[PDB]
Amino acid sequence: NADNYKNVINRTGAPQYMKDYDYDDHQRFNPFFDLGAWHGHLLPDGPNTMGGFPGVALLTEEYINFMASNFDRLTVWQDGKKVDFTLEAYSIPGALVQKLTAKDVQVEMTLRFATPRTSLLETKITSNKPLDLVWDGELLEKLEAKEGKPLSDKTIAGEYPDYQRKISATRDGLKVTFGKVRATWDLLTSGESEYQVHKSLPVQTEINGNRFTSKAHINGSTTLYTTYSHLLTAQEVSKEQMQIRDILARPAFYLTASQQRWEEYLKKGLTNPDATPEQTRVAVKAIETLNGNWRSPGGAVKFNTVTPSVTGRWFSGNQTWPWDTWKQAFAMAHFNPDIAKENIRAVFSWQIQPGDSVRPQDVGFVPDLIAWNLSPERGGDGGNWNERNTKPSLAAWSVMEVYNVTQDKTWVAEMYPKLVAYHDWWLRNRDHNGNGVPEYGATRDKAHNTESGEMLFTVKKGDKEETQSGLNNYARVVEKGQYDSLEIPAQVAASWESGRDDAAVFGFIDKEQLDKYVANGGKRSDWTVKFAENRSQDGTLLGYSLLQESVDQASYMYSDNHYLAEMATILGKPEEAKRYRQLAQQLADYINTCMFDPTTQFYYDVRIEDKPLANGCAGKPIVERGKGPEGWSPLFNGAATQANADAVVKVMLDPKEFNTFVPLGTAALTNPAFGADIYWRGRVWVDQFWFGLKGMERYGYRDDALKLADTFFRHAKGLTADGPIQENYNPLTGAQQGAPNFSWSAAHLYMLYNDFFRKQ
Ligand SMILES: OC[C@H]1O[C@H](O)[C@H](O)[C@@H](O)[C@H]1O
Ligand SMILES: [Ca+2]
Secondary structure, eight states: OGGGOTTSSOOBOOOOEEEEEOTTSSBSSOOBOOTTOSEEBOBOOSTTTTTSOOOEEEEOSSSEEEEEEEEEEEEEEETTEEOOOEEEEEEETTEEEEEEEOSSEEEEEEEEEEETTEEEEEEEEEESSOEEEEEEEEEOOEEEEETTEESOSOBHHHHOTTOOOEEEEETTEEEEEOOOOEETTTEEOOSOOEEEEEESSOOEEEEETTEEEEEEEEOSSEEEEEEEEEEOSHHHHHHHHHHHHHHHHSHHHHHHHHHHHHHHHHHHHOOOTTSOHHHHHHHHHHHHHHHHTEEOOBTTBOSOEEOSOTTOTTTOTTOBOHHHHHHHHHHHTTTOHHHHHHHHHHHHHTOOOTTOSSOGGGTTOOOSBBOSSOOGGGTSOOSSOBOSOOOOOOHHHHHHHHHHHHOOHHHHHHHHHHHHHHHHHHHHHSOTTOSSOOOOEEOOOTTTBOTTOOBEEEEEETTEEEEEESHHHHHHHHHHOOOSEEEOHHHHHHHHHHTOTTOGGGTOOOHHHHHHHHHTTOOGGGGOOOEEEEEOTTOOEEEEEESEEOHHHHHHHHHHHHHHHHHHHHTTOHHHHHHHHHHHHHHHHHIIIIIEETTTTEEOOEEOOSSOOTTSOSSOBOGGGOOOGGGGHHHHHTOSOHHHHHHHHHHHHOTTTTOOSSOSOSSOTTOTTOOTTOTTTTOEEHHHHHHHHHHHHHTTOHHHHHHHHHHHHHHSTTTTSSSOOOSEEOTTTOOEESOSSOHHHHHHHHHHHHHTOOOO
């Protein structure tokens, strides 16, 4: 099956910089990674890379960095003369292949992954006469470029004097050793990491600084085997040696293992017979993308996980977020369920337990960002690890999907208490007014407050910065309004927790947009989101909340309650199931009564006003900040009444609202803060789009949902091309932006393939 999908993504490239970046700082080539390995490979594109797989990409704990352009490139010689080959090179799901053809000699090279640290190259050589073989390689010297043009003349050695890269011959090949570099935002190594090459035949190696040449002589047709291993600790180095020996001992077994695993991914995953060839290839792109972004256990993360992008500036290593994980595992349930399960475990593996040394007041909390290196507060030197906030919860929905496929009740039994702990955490620490409807917010944190628990903030006016603390001073300053801006680190983290950091609904709007809003009759203060601290009975600071209840978050809580009810029933916990059923019903009633505007016939967030409404709602729908994708969150999540869903579907299909060139973007055309190129105020994301389609389907509009899917398929740029998957689309032009090889989009493109794409 794999052979039907050659070059689904362009995996060619010959990088010349460690940071061979695109416009947005992401590695501009798309290397092949598999088995959760910590290195990857590209295809040759021409005579200068022919005979090897260039662009060895190392995952240095939390980042992707290229090591070399050519490394272990084969040239062949027969009687003192170099054999001139022609090249055919291609990817398939699970392998890179290149075929070299000359008259008297042919070579077939197949590169697959054998372990979580090691790839295996088969070099199959056909020749009726003896040959001399030569392998060469060279470490990169130059640091950084953008769009192929250097940003500076900085060198790698120059930038990182302790990196101390050295190539050494071994008893069975060679190795590259690396010094300890703790460059928190660029390059992380242990001082014990290595890149090892082991081969099945004796070789003779000459080393010349950062280049090498290796030689061997063979007597005729022969198949050689070479392992490539990026090993990040002393203990990884030690443990891998017996694996590498087994691989060179049983190479066919490892090749077959990979072939079969990939046939299984494709068999299990490609289950929409109505889909066209083009549509199915999109699903294969998503499968290759997701599987490449999977990482084995590494550092503090003791489970397999999946990151938003192995090639991403800030998304590589094993950096893992919960929001991304829910959708990732939802999709991967349908083709790589074992890793879907692991990914969810990874996220809950650092869930806060009672007695936690940093935040005992956050039991059940799930960190925003986990990674190889713990933060200084937990004993590591990691800059990325984040516990300032979490992300919106579709955890139960994610877990349930894994169950739907596997029917594995032991999986439900495992996750249920962890899901319940997160649930209970939301209700304790993100419910400022105590009404059972959550807010987006932030934790108590060194970045957010003093040691005594006084919320930090910085008032700005012209060029004067005034840094104060305490919720007393914040209220006193908000009223006056004699500031250009008010920076509240805890409110920044609340925007991160919402998952949509410049959204209209959360008060984000540009200067010219606001002027027009005011000229049309509104007030500037309509766009001010107020902020509050959350405390327990005894006065313990639990964290913070936006003084605003979000309709998407409420709907996700409805989801959580609905799916916990089903899990409780599966597990034979009827009384707990009944409680969640009632909580679900309570949220649905609140969402429908409080958040659905009778007048505009659409859903919106509500403010937590100074006093609740007579009907018990926290405040009125925030109609004036305009319509967004949160308005269909109740449909996707199943909270809406039929009447309210019918109304919302009318708006979604309205070409003056959301039925744009690429439909269902992150702000209606009528939104006062709309911008086609703004991430969370116009741009179309595949998750929010798919939530829309599912929401429509649930309330009887599958036919219209299938039409929108067709429109997406015809209008979203690059979909049928061989480019890597990115983050979002301009709703007017269809133009793509964001990180290449983006898991979240791949997840929902896969879902669209399964649920809505079809032959017209
Ligand atoms: O560093 C944490 C940070 O990472 C990325 O920037 C995300 O987009 C934010 O929401 C936040 O999680
Ligand atoms: Ca509340």
